[PDB]
Amino acid sequence: PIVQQGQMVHQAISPRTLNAWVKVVAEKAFSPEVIPMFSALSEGATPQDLNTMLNTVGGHQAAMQMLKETINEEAAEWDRLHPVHAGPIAPGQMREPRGSDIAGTTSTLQEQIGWMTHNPPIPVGEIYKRWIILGLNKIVRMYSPTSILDIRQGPKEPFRDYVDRFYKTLRAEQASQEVKNWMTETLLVQNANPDCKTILKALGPGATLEEMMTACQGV
Amino acid sequence: PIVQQGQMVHQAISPRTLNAWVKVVAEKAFSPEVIPMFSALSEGATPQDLNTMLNTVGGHQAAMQMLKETINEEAAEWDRLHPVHAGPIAPGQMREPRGSDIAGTTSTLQEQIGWMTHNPPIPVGEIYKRWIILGLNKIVRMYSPTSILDIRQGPKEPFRDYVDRFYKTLRAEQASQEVKNWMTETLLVQNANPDCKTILKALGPGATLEEMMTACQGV
Amino acid sequence: PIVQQGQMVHQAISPRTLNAWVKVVAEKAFSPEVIPMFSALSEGATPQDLNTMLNTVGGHQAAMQMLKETINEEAAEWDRLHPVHAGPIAPGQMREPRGSDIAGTTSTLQEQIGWMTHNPPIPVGEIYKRWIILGLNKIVRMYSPTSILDIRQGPKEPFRDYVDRFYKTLRAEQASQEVKNWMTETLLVQNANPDCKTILKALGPGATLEEMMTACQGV
Amino acid sequence: PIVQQGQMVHQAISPRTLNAWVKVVAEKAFSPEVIPMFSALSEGATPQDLNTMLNTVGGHQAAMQMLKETINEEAAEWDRLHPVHAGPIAPGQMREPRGSDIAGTTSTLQEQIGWMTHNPPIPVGEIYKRWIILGLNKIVRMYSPTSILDIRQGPKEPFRDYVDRFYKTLRAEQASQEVKNWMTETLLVQNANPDCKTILKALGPGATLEEMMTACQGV
Amino acid sequence: PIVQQGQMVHQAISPRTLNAWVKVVAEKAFSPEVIPMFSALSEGATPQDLNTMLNTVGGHQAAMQMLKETINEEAAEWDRLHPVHAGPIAPGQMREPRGSDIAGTTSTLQEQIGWMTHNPPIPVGEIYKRWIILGLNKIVRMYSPTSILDIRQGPKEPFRDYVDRFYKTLRAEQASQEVKNWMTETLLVQNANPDCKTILKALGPGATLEEMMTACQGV
Amino acid sequence: PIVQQGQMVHQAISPRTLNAWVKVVAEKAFSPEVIPMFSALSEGATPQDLNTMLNTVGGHQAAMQMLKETINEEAAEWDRLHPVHAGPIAPGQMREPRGSDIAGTTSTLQEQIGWMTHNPPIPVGEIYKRWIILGLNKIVRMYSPTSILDIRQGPKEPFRDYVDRFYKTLRAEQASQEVKNWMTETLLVQNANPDCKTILKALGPGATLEEMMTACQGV
Ligand SMILES: [Cl-]
Ligand SMILES: [Cl-]
Ligand SMILES: [Cl-]
Ligand SMILES: [Cl-]
Ligand SMILES: [Cl-]
Ligand SMILES: [Cl-]
Ligand SMILES: [Cl-]
Ligand SMILES: [Cl-]
Ligand SMILES: [Cl-]
Ligand SMILES: [Cl-]
Ligand SMILES: [Cl-]
Ligand SMILES: [Cl-]
Ligand SMILES: [Cl-]
Ligand SMILES: [Cl-]
Ligand SMILES: [Cl-]
Ligand SMILES: [Cl-]
Ligand SMILES: [Cl-]
Ligand SMILES: [Cl-]
Ligand SMILES: [Cl-]
Ligand SMILES: [Cl-]
Ligand SMILES: [Cl-]
Ligand SMILES: [Cl-]
Ligand SMILES: [Cl-]
Ligand SMILES: [Cl-]
Ligand SMILES: [Cl-]
Ligand SMILES: [Cl-]
Ligand SMILES: [Cl-]
Ligand SMILES: [Cl-]
Ligand SMILES: [Cl-]
Ligand SMILES: [Cl-]
Ligand SMILES: [Cl-]
Ligand SMILES: [Cl-]
Ligand SMILES: [Cl-]
Ligand SMILES: [Cl-]
Ligand SMILES: [Cl-]
Ligand SMILES: [Cl-]
């Protein structure tokens, strides 16, 4: 990656960053929290470091292939929006990146460093990471085994566990924020057990989650 | 985070900081000592690092949602107290942060660095951490299974263990310091077993905890 | 290795880089993901560091000997393409590297540093790593126990597992990218079980992997 | 903490310093060797780092409360010896610390850094650590289960084990150095078993511990 | 060791370098791969660091004594080839090292640093490491339990395992490279089982190891 | 410790140096290899760091007390050889250290840094470490359970194991180097089993250990 005196300098990906990413992939598969962890382990990463993290994953090659196809889609869109201009690269300049250059497959490390350190900067690492996180979200949604409509509180289930399952599945839903606002507004109280449901209905339409869980505590 | 020559510089969150936070969350849930540990693992953290630490938590999504609602409350209050002034941002200045900018959801990393390194500084990281610690305290209080009024010394319980339970629950109470002074002043001696209670009454109203535990040692 | 102020400086290979490489070799043998991991653990490595990583491998001496022979082939080709010019090395210059100099067996550490830090640079470390990765690919292909033509979906096998095996073996194939495009275009749908095969045929010749796996999900 | 070019600079407490302190507290309770370890893990620590180390301790809240009371005693004494002078803080100066400022509860991190880096320095971190180590010594003495007068050599106990127990308990005694000189001068030879006691009496009043243990070796 | 701005600076040997060397010695005894690992863990090491690594080895004191005798032989030879010149050391110079000075037993750390940082340099660390690696090779050869003449393929043994044993023992042989070329040229095909031996004879005298192992794959 | 631009700077003792020293003390007691490890973990250490390493040792308080007495002996001798001169310390100078100042009990950290960084330097850390290593050698010799005169080869014992035990005990002897030369010259061949003893007698008085162990290999 590249780390900030003021100047930005490049260093290799660390052994325990590699081992941490491999470990979390091997242990957690494609649970939603893997996406921030990835984004955490790839701060300021070049496309070479991102390809390094993706390639060190053994197994799950169906999901990794889907990730390849998503990356290729975003690269093709970048090529459509950024048409290349023919002409020799002048002294004191650098060529404009293509879709495959941001993906790190047709660009050297020195070119990526040059794009990322220029003023103004061309952040190929954050663009590539954006595409990767897009594909990862597609995979997390695709591998989720539950739907938010099926989360229903059991007759003896404590309210805290029901809310845990509900917002876990809701985190795996990854629909828009307004759709999630509606899901929280309707399904959570709607799909509670009769007692807790009655009490939550008695709370009112503008109750917070803290008040809702406090109301059904001893229940 | 940002680390201090004199100049403050930015670096990525470390792999063992991430793994340490994930580990302590997975092992200790929401015991009070998790709050300082968090504050320890996020020294000089940007809002991006704080969101990184919060998002890498799998499970406990009810508590994390309550934390989201608390953060949104504090952000709305910040917006109420700091009304934004319309006008183009002049060369040599930066826009004033909104509530969602301090929360890191509507501000880039460069903007957070700029606010945090300016003279005078706008410490968005410590404000956001303040809100987060507020919500975490709400969660710790909400998930505490015991009340300080129910802590009573057993007939054969050593005094040290009773004081341990008492001040553990008292730490989970998180009422004001004067209320805790009164709780220590009344309940501790009041709820001891008859023998130790008699001896502590014989000590006097101004005895220290060291003297109280010394008095009921062999007892 | 050599790490980037701007100037490139040299430091020793780290203990946990060594232990990480030894560990991944001992645990994963010659699975394809070992090649990027290697390339990850040897960023900016000198030929001395690469020889260090190769020599610390105990066992697998057949594969390591094959790697030696591949390295010698690439070195002989480098000598054929780069004939050495006789003459004394002038003050302010350095000799041009031979095949064995890039392989680190006839060149000192100071010579490798000098080649790698000169302007223009002679990247002996990346050339040697290129040869090493070539031989490693030969070994990975040679030790693969399965062929892509034998990957067939079971009558009760979920489609995701079948695609996992398919693209794992395909990753071990390491034929050209167009040949792999044809393999994906023909064998994947061709070798599915009758039900999923019928549905995929109904999808159309231009369906993505995401659409194909979505179609055979409940199936 | 603050680490030494010449200038003293501040950095956050490290994850493995935190985990090391938490681990040693969880494993060793309040054995005497915990006090140097603490002092080792808090070299150059600010009051914020010391409060961080104390607050991350879960359980043992009786001892931690006693530590709070000791710290408050030392702070009150500091306030008695250092009366505050009223007046506005002049440009180029900083206010003088109170007892609670050294304890880190009423002083910001910037104020602690300013006191610790000024010439002449006001070492609030070493003063606070001094108070903390005082309270920790009180706790170690209070939780010691044995008294030095009860350490007596068994009829078949090797002399080395007896001396081990003796100086362990003596380390837990923490009386003045002259009192410990007398304890070593009298009890050690006095409380040995009859044979070893006779031989040590035959050694003479000025024998070293090496000579004493050599004399009762084969015995 | 000493690590490279440009200037070479000295630092202490790291705890995990020590623990790594102790661990690999305790686990792998004197397998050939211990020699590169050693050379890896002692890059740029002073004679003091090398003596540190050798002295921390508990047990195997026969091999360590043999290593002492080899080091003394090489030191005596260095003294024979480099006779010392009598005379006072002039201001701006340093004495020439003896055999025991390179071995670190009669030279201080400052003298070793001075020799290693001078221009032109006297690399006492690499000379001492050269002697140490010589003795280590003698020990590895002496503790090898097998001879290359006894490696014979079993009637049901896969060819890959036979080549593994063959080149393992060959690595333990450590004869000259031409002798090893002859051993590979004769014994490998000569000592294979009848079927594989017939096929390898049918391959021809100029076949690579890759072709030889490919020929006897299904066999 | 203090680490070398050129200038020597001070930093705190590291958590894994502490944990490494505590671990090796807990696992290996007082085997000879603990002394170099100690000397390895305390390179450039101040007297405060050395006292830190000694004080963190729990248990073995008999040996630690003997170490205290040895340190006090060496300090008293230093005071006898270096009489203190009365007079005020002039501006631009520092007081000369006493025995207890080198031991770190009557000198602050700043005084130790000042002595260690002055030109010419007063290396109080290496003097204190010298005394500590002296006492540690006394303890290692005192706790050795075997004498070199009792090491005798068994009738079926391989020669390598016998030499291992012999030089282990010899390392624990710690007599002068000429006495050890005589012990190797006489006892090793003298105390071998009859067969190996006959063969070694047939070797001659000037045989190396390599030749001696080679002679009794198959025997
Ligand atoms: Cl995996
Ligand atoms: Cl370009
Ligand atoms: Cl662009
Ligand atoms: Cl963009
Ligand atoms: Cl509940
Ligand atoms: Cl569920
Ligand atoms: Cl969790
Ligand atoms: Cl702005
Ligand atoms: Cl503001
Ligand atoms: Cl503010
Ligand atoms: Cl008690
Ligand atoms: Cl309780
Ligand atoms: Cl292996
Ligand atoms: Cl040259
Ligand atoms: Cl060239
Ligand atoms: Cl090239
Ligand atoms: Cl499926
Ligand atoms: Cl398969
Ligand atoms: Cl604890
Ligand atoms: Cl002030
Ligand atoms: Cl003051
Ligand atoms: Cl003071
Ligand atoms: Cl004894
Ligand atoms: Cl006891
Ligand atoms: Cl060992
Ligand atoms: Cl000299
Ligand atoms: Cl020389
Ligand atoms: Cl030389
Ligand atoms: Cl085979
Ligand atoms: Cl074998
Ligand atoms: Cl111990
Ligand atoms: Cl002074
Ligand atoms: Cl002196
Ligand atoms: Cl001296
Ligand atoms: Cl033997
Ligand atoms: Cl023995």
Residue numbers in the entry:
A (entry chain A), B (entry chain A), C (entry chain A), D (entry chain A), E (entry chain A), F (entry chain A): 1 to 4, 7 to 221
Extract from the study:
Multiple copies of CA monomers assemble around the viral genome to form the characteristic cone-shaped structure of the mature HIV-1 capsid core. The core is composed of ∼200 hexamers and precisely 12 pentamers.
One interaction is significantly more frequent at the pentameric interface than at the hexameric interface: a hydrogen bond (H-bond) between the E28 of helix 1 (H1) in one CANTD and the K30′ in helix 1′ (H1′) of the neighboring CANTD. A similar trend is seen in 20 subnanometer cryo-ET structures from intact virions, showing closer proximity of E28 to K30′ Cα in pentamers than in hexamers. MD studies performed with WT and E28A CA dimers have identified a possible mechanism through which the E28∼K30′ interaction affects the global dynamics of CA during assembly. Loss of the E28∼K30′ interaction revealed changes in flexibility at residue positions proximal to E28 and K30′ (residues 59 to 61) and, interestingly, at a remote region (residues 201 to 209) as well. The latter changes suggest that the E28A mutation at the interpentamer interface allosterically affects the interactions between the H1 and H1′ helices. Our results suggest that E28A affects neither the formation of the Dsym and the TOD nor their polymerization, as we observed tubes in vitro. However, we showed that E28A affects the incorporation of pentamers. Moreover, we propose that the E28∼K30′ H-bond between the adjacent monomers in the pentameric dimer is the key to this flexibility.
